[PDB]
Amino acid sequence: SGFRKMAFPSGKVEGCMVQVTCGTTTLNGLWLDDVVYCPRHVINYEDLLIRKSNHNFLVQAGNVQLRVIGHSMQNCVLKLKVDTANPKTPKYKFVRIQPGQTFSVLACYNGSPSGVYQCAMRPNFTIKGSFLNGSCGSVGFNIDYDCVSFCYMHHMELPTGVHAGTDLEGNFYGPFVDRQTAQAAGTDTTITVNVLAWLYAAVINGDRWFLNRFTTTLNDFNLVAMKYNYEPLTQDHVDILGPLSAQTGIAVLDMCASLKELLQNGMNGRTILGSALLEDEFTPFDVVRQCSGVTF
Amino acid sequence: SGFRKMAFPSGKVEGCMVQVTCGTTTLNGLWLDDVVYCPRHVICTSEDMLNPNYEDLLIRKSNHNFLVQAGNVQLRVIGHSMQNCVLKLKVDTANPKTPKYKFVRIQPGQTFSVLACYNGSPSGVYQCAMRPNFTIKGSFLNGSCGSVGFNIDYDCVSFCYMHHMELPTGVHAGTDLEGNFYGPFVDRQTAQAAGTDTTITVNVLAWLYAAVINGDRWFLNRFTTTLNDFNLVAMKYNYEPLTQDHVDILGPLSAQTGIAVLDMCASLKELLQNGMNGRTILGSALLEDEFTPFDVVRQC
Ligand SMILES: CO[C@@]1(C(=O)Nc2cncc3ccccc23)CCOc2c(F)cc(F)cc21
Numbered sequence: 001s002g003f004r005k006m007a008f009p010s011g012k013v014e015g016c017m018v019q020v021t022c023g024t025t026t027l028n029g030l031w032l033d034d035v036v037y038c039p040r041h042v043i044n045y046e047d048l049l050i051r052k053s054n055h056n057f058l059v060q061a062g063n064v065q066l067r068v069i070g071h072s073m074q075n076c077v078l079k080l081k082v083d084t085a086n087p088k089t090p091k092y093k094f095v096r097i098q099p100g101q102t103f104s105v106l107a108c109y110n111g112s113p114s115g116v117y118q119c120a121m122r123p124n125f126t127i128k129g130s131f132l133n134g135s136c137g138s139v140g141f142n143i144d145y146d147c148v149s150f151c152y153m154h155h156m157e158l159p160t161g162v163h164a165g166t167d168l169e170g171n172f173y174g175p176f177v178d179r180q181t182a183q184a185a186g187t188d189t190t191i192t193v194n195v196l197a198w199l200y201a202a203v204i205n206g207d208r209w210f211l212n213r214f215t216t217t218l219n220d221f222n223l224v225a226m227k228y229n230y231e232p233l234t235q236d237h238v239d240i241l242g243p244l245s246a247q248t249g250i251a252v253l254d255m256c257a258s259l260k261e262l263l264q265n266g267m268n269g270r271t272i273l274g275s276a277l278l279e280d281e282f283t284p285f286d287v288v289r290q291c292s293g294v295t296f
Numbered sequence: 297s298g299f300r301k302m303a304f305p306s307g308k309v310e311g312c313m314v315q316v317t318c319g320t321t322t323l324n325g326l327w328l329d330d331v332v333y334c335p336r337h338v339i340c341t342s343e344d345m346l347n348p349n350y351e352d353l354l355i356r357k358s359n360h361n362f363l364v365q366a367g368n369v370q371l372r373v374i375g376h377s378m379q380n381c382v383l384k385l386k387v388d389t390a391n392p393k394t395p396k397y398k399f400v401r402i403q404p405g406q407t408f409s410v411l412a413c414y415n416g417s418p419s420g421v422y423q424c425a426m427r428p429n430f431t432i433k434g435s436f437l438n439g440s441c442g443s444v445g446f447n448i449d450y451d452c453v454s455f456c457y458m459h460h461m462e463l464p465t466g467v468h469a470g471t472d473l474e475g476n477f478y479g480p481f482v483d484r485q486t487a488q489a490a491g492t493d494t495t496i497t498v499n500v501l502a503w504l505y506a507a508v509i510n511g512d513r514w515f516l517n518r519f520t521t522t523l524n525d526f527n528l529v530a531m532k533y534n535y536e537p538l539t540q541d542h543v544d545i546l547g548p549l550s551a552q553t554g555i556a557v558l559d560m561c562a563s564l565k566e567l568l569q570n571g572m573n574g575r576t577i578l579g580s581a582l583l584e585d586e587f588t589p590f591d592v593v594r595q596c
């Protein structure tokens with residue numbers, strides 16, 4: 001029993017964290033094989049990069065200095081070719097994730113991991129992370145069997161305290177730029193499929209007070225959801241919740257009527273899984289994984 | 297900016313997780329140097345679980361009864377001894393991934409990261425606190441026994457917890473790494489119940505300071521209180537008494553934000569009386585008590 005916000009074991013990623021210094025800026029890099037990836041703002045980025053030489057980038061893997069033998073830019077990520085292939089390089093992939101998808105963040109400072117937390121890519125493409133100055137280059141990942149899927153690299157903090165970054169190919173999530181200018185996160189919405197997954201996790205854990213006898217059409221649910229700034233629920237989401245619906249005996253549209261009532265009436269002093277708000281940072285796969293004990 | 301529940305990087309602990317099998321039972325062990333530590337109930341059957349004589353059961357076992365697996369490699373057990381509720385299986389190979397470590401016993405309110413494992417394989421990492429009633433509100437399935445709680449200070453892993461059991465309410469009980477249980481619990485299937493839980497007051501105050509540092513100030517008020525008046529109000533809401541030690545510990549956060557501890561106590565009293573009124577503090581509609589003053593300063 002129990003339900004916790006749980007991150008993937010960070011070990012495979014800790015072995016890849018390095019410190020990258022260029023001039024006055026020190027941030028984190030991800031060392032995979034003989035390439036170190038980091039935010040390009042460490043340095044007109046094409047013009048600034050041409051002016052740099054390999055010896056301007058100081059890369060430190062623990063107490064060892066790596067020698068940079070090349071540099072190139074891919075979108076908003078800088079790739080520093082190094083002379084040594086990382087012996088701790090895990091099986092990995094670069095994947096771009098969708099809003100609503102969750103991942104673990106290994107927060108680093110000076111190439112040293114300090115914390116690991118779980119979070120979701122918000123529908124407005126920001127992450128509600130925990131990052132201080134020097135965290136840039138910290139990465140988000142998932143682990144599938146023995147394979148690390150890198151999905152995020154931290155670049156900046158928006159004026160509201162939320163965070164923006166790119167996939168490992170340097171493409172920003174959202175309409176953000178890595179330049180000093182006025183940027184604002186759009187109005188956020190609740191990840192509906194994740195709230196439903198979390199309501200299924202609550203039922204599995206014995207918390208059933210919110211369940212009702214009613215069901216709803218997908219269209220009627222979406223009309224209500226739209227009013228409360230909730231993301232539309234698609235037939236794909238209904239299909240993905242299928243296994244949890246089968247396990248608990250609560251059809252997805254049945255759980256949708258519970259969510260509809262929860263929105264129109266509140267919790268009335270009650271909590272679900274120790275929370276007074278509807279949690280939207282557990283995907284349906286996260287719920288199945290935690291309420292089944294899948295290991296990595 | 298931002299405030300998250302944050303666990304320590306689990307890598308140093310993942311390199312210590314092993315699978316320990318004795319008879320039909322399979323749980324997790326912690327391999328440090330040439331010793332594997334695990335819950336002593338691994339020697340039990342369902343028939344022993346109610347009133348087990350662990351000294352008697354252990355004397356009947358031999359080194360070849362314990363099957364230890366580190367990844368795809370079987371370790372050979374060359375000795376076994378029991379220290380309180382932990383079994384120590386001496387092995388022939390020292391773990392090359394053994395980090396700098398210490399065994400520390402923690403006090404209620406203290407937080408730590410848990411590396412949840414099944415069959416000697418880590419599946420997740422989460423943060424939690426030792427509740428005032430000595431239980432942890434973990435996320436553990438059958439097979440998670442032997443999963444450990446830890447903190448990391450600079451390069452040293454302080455092991456503070458090893459999971460042993462789930463109480464009938466879904467909360468969890470375990471020991472420090474010397475086998476001493478936290479709380480009045482025993483590793484028997486006899487009727488056991490967690491005492492009524494209470495809120496870790498010093499942790500809530502630390503979290504209210506974290507909210508002020510992050511720009512949240514709506515809950516602040518013009519009032520101050522005596523420590524005794526705060527404790528009389530606190531107790532009525534099942535909040536732990538706040539000691540002068542707690543007031544002293546909150547000193548640095550009080551200095552950083554310019555709000556005196558008894559001033560923040562008066563804000564907490566108001567929050568307990570009124571609730572949040574549709575508002576949130578650091579994205580939460582409840583008062584968070586699993587961030588210590590040390591965690592708040594660390595993260596901020
Ligand atoms: C140094 O990178 C910046 C930044 O956001 N950094 C941060 C990223 N995370 C957490 C932070 C917590 C506190 C302080 C800064 C944080 C600040 C300057 O403006 C910019 C900028 F125009 C573009 C850019 F891609 C980054 C940055």
Ligand SMILES: CO[C@@]1(C(=O)Nc2cncc3ccccc23)CCOc2c(F)cc(F)cc21
Nearest residue numbers: 001337345436437438460461462483484485486
């Ligand atoms: C080792 O088995 C026990 C156990 O609690 N295990 C578990 C630990 N965590 C999560 C669990 C989730 C679901 C099922 C069991 C869980 C159950 C039987 O009674 C006992 C017992 F008397 C003493 C003991 F120290 C352990 C155990």
